[PDB]
Amino acid sequence: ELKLIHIFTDGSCLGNPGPGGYGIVMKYKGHTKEMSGGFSLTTNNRMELLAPIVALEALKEPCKIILTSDSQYVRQGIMTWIHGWKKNGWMTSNGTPVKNVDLWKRLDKAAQLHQIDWRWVKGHAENERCHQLARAAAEANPTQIDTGY
Template sequence: MDLKRVEMYADGACLGNPGPGGWAALLRYGEREKLVSGGEDHTTNNRMELLAVISGLKALKEPCRVDVFTDSRYLQGAFAKGWLENWRTNGWRRADRRPVENQDLWQALLQALGTHQVEFHWVKGHAGHPENERVDREARRQASLRKRGLGENRT
């Protein structure tokens, strides 16, 4: 069965770390695009990076091949460098035996990945990549809305 090939551009932002945060994911299939976004009142940038990808994957209606483009070394490194598999094997503990931060979201991400074939790609942030700049603007807009008490949780 040939799966649809989807590009996802995902980013998170935080005003203060922790502070009000936002996330955004742009999904592209051929000429069709869908932008999903949201935020939280008190969070961290890493949590927003993870929520962007989780929410983007949840927005897909069927199993797909997904190329995820992110400027988050934290997110991309978890897969490319095997951190995530090591954390799972070690009972969600890091090499120094401390608990893994954001375990709830890593587990949610693993669940969201379940039906899809996903490959993560790192892009340099704030370097003129049009789609990365677009999701960055939306994530920062969501964080700003949260700061002003105007945002909704849309995860």
């Protein structure tokens, strides 16, 4: 039995590109924790994507994950683009490397370690908490660089 973990994820960068950040709520049994992060310049797509990756990368063994996200960007990668890209060597239709490849390869790598059940949202209470986390980090005058951006 892997541990059962619930992960909730958000990114926010409104003004896009511009400074932004990400938020994460992790639940195990009774325990809940939060991470967040801010960047001086990033996209909303990168934040939405970084948030599940930072939460996954933080785990200390393999686990069974229920992962809930609001991002149509992340959803479509998981369901369609990733398989597509991976079997095209992380090139798009123009031979160009995938925009945000740094991040997609981190997610794909991280996803393999875990039993992930992906939940896609439109309002879930850990997700709202995430949006608060992301907005605060984005608003705390971040200087940190998004290196892959």
